[PDB]
Design a protein around this ligand. Sequence first.
Ligand code: MG
Ligand code: MG
Lengths: 362, 361, 323, 323
Amino acid sequence: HRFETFTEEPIRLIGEEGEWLGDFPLDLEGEKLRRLYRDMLAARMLDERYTILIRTGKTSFIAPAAGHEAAQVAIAHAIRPGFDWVFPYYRDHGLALALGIPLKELLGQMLATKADPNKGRQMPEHPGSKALNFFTVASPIASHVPPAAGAAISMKLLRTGQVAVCTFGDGATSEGDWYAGINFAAVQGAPAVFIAENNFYAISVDYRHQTHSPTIADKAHAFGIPGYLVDGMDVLASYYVVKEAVERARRGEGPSLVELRVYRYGPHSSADDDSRYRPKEEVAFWRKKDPIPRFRRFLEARGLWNEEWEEDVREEIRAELERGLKEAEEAGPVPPEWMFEDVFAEKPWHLLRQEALLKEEL
Amino acid sequence: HRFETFTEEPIRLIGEEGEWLGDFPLDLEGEKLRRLYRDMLAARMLDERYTILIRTGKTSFIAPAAGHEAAQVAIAHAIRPGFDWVFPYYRDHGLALALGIPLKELLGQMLATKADPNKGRQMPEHPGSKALNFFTVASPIASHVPPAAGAAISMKLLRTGQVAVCTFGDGATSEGDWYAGINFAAVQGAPAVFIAENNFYAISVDYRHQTHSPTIADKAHAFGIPGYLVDGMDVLASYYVVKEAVERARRGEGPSLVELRVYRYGPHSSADDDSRYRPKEEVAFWRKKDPIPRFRRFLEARGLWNEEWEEDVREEIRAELERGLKEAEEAGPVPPEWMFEDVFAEKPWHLLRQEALLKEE
Amino acid sequence: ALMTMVQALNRALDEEMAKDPRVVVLGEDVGKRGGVFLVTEGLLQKYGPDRVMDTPLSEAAIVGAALGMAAHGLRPVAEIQFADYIFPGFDQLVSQVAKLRYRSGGQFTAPLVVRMPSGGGVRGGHHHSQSPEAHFVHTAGLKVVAVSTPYDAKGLLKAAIRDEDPVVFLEPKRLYRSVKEEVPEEDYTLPIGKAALRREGKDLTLICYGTVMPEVLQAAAELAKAGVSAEVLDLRTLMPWDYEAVMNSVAKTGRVVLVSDAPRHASFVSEVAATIAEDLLDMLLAPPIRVTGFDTPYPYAQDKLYLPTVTRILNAAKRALDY
Amino acid sequence: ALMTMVQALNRALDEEMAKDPRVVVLGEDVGKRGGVFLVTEGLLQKYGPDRVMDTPLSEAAIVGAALGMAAHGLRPVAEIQFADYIFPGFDQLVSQVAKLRYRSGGQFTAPLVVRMPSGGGVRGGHHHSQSPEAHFVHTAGLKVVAVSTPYDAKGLLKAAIRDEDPVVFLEPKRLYRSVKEEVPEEDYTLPIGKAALRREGKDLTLICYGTVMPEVLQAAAELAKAGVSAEVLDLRTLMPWDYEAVMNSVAKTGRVVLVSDAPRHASFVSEVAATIAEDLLDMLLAPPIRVTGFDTPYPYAQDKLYLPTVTRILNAAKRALDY
Ligand SMILES: [Mg+2]
Ligand SMILES: [Mg+2]
């Protein structure tokens, strides 16, 4: 099976009544289907926990991912966590969670405690994990695209059989490095899948003022690779299209550009205010497209969901969140001296001198 | 009349036997057709004179444009010189000449004499002219694309009715700034026409290792603007398609991406060694596609060319080159002190000090 | 009346745009949103989309387009959201903007301004705290200005807009609303290339600018308690910097401490320090001491310690004084 | 055997690639063409296209992909055709490469090398002559090396390839074939971070590196004829630079002249000069004098006047000696 490329209408698999729209049979086992739902709830609840962390001064910054759950959870399940690599951006904490990164580590990074394997080096929303090949988030928009291409080329040359998935927002597609990186990956037929989590906004700049191409998928023409327009609020459509791109990359057929249309329910960030440049009618309209209730209906229509399970799953998640936050906090503050560690493998003379100077003040 | 976008085969208007292939009737007067040929011969001969300047050491660097004449001459004639703006790159001396830039200034820049309005500040092949809105060439590949987009945006905001054309090679399309600049121009619907002089090589890296898109024209889809695949060795096809894009831009319909497929007959530059990475069959094959003999046959079939005219034209061009070179050399060397001028509108304390220091030398 | 730096900057923009139709603002989120720091608030409403325009998310497109606009017929004031993000458009800045006048023999000019918030002290981590001025100062052809007060913000931004030479204008974000100072509404400008004497003194010269001003000023206050008079000189313009003001102060005091939050190695204060040593060795009663950001990326967890503290500055002052 | 810098560099690459399958070369025209300066000549033929790869014309793609390759498992040696062209890939270099280890808490590393021809004196104008090392030294997380002899070229490039920290390796192009020095065929490396004494002396210290070495050594020779004993120190590594070697020499001579063809303002030599003044004021018999490239874009017509001349260096030495 092969999805159609550059479709005018975004690819969908879940009908509004829960019907299967695929031109191929649904092959996911019931257990995996329910896990997709489970992880979307967990991602949503993590996001809501973040709102509380901001409100209580536990963290200084958050980038609301509510509305991106189907896209992020689908991507996490379309690859093999711990084997394949992920080059995410700051809004991907739902993806990070679904990938298996311990809440202790995600929250530790949000709180800058020693629970953060990244040692509180960066501001919140910059998680990273060596264990799960989750390339530490970097702030500059699209700066992680060329590295994603390079890692994929390495995978190809070393014959590891791995794939590198690279996620970014719509605004990122306007950066020169975004184009430059994908172009190289395409020429080398590297096993990389570039995925856009298109929420139609780059802070306050809307899609129309971002680029003139009708879709992001159309940009694939510039690289000679397949481009896909997908309903990012449809977890099955997102999963299967990305999975197909991953399989294509894994068999050596080169990269793909997958556009997952989603919506950012919250503001751009805790430092922003969405209810200032977006029409309430637009937000409300997309709120009715929440990926969670949509997939719930799909499961419910097949006897794969009920209220009791729903409640059980939610209580288990809130418990995991409470435990994760507790562990992150109990880890303790990061030492001042750590400011001089990891610039290089070993500290050179000037850093040793600078560290001694700071110690005078401590 | 409108040309097809994203065509499978490159658009062509001149047949192999010199026949007209257009759907519409040719609407260029015989005088204009002869001018296109005259300009291509001038560009070709300018290129051959550059080869001689290298041999005699008069210039230290050249970027052979032989094979790009139909594309460059067509572009110069599709716009309004002195009104529209041109954002060229180093291999566009043929375009510069056809645009009207005096040989004195072009050769002055190649020799770094006071005849160079750019004051011998850069290495050869970096011409520039305020009078003809020929934005001074910069070395970094594609670096002039965002600026071109900006000038176009300015033309739109100020409603000058002008158009900005931006030329670059195939390799330039791989740079992030190329993409970033065109994207902004497209969003703003700016009057800019981006033209690729695709010779299938970026020094020694061939098209296949440059990009995976089958054509450069296809890249236009990433901006939602029209893309055209043209036979760049066909001066008429190049002229008409670029002309159409220019008119579209001028009437406010936004940018276009035009790919002119040409061939680089000489090495990448005087510092290169082409005969080491390009198959002889390929070069020989394309030498038979030279735009000059091709258009010559088109003119001959229409009574617009004869051997005697060929002689007179070439002799006239040679005389022009001699006169231009003489005036350039005659201008004399650029003063040492000029090295401290134009960094800023006026020299700050540190440059005044540095100038004084050097003066004691 | 009293206003914050943000208000003074906004006022400067409003004033220049009202005076010259050619002045245009462009950048990410500068229009409807009025800027992520509200510096361009209300300008779109007042001047329209042809004067204030949100751009795609590309610093190369912003800087380069600004250059083309300036070369053709406009006077663009481009905004780079955070100084940390100038890099994607670095080649446009150093290869196109900085060298246009020079490489064209003066045929083409770049009357453009590139403003950007900068500096630490705001918990911005690696890319919301950088002070990249050295990169600009090292590039011939770019004037560089870093303001630290509302009064200077308005006066110098207006001067930059009127200046035909390209100007990179840095606004320390920690100072955007840190204080409300008297800023005349009347039209006034300040000289680019001239330092400002914040406090006169004769025992020690404190050379500084931008981000670190709060700590440097308090350090001078602490010194005054001990009977030590520190002369505080805010350079303001980093290129071309006020050579005369610097040398006149150091000649008087005989001792100098230079402060900045930018990384130490090959920094702008290193340039001034090296120049003082090369030209005034005979006037120095103590070694020129530099208090700078550490040679590490900007840390989130230790933000408070990376940014020079009053204590760190005072320890350096004591070193110079007891030498 | 006797070989040029190009031959020494080529040998270093060949040797390291023979030793480790992970070592790969990538850049514009490094394959079949063998490099525009022939540094990678013959490597493609010997190791194949999967180890010597021509890339599209994008420095962001080159530097960033190299970073990705290094983080995953390869040990890439990326080439930027001319140091002047590092800018289009500047964000990749300073935001991704330099900060990877730091921002990831050491979870991810960047064992990569970025080679680039540099320096003036070759009629390269604005973009075939630059010496941008200052930009790199100012960026925490990058080791920076600039060689000046065939012997150092092989030894330090091999050292860089083995070093796990990102290394920006500058090769002064005017020195690519200027001399044939004895270079052991056997495997050997040189220490990154250590200067090399070219001449021992006690009357003056000449600090330099890369591009200007020819003129500096010539100046030293001429000073000797005049009875002046100058000590010549080739830093070799700019970050981290040999602090001890520098301070020991200046302490002994009491006078120092620093030379480089890089623009003066906020340059690397300005950093060393400022450091000498800050730490060895008491040992200075004369002001630290800097002979640098001028603060202008690199000129074509005046190429030979911009690059420091033996005369300019001698005039500086005289000022230091007569002080
Ligand atoms: Mg978005
Ligand atoms: Mg080409």
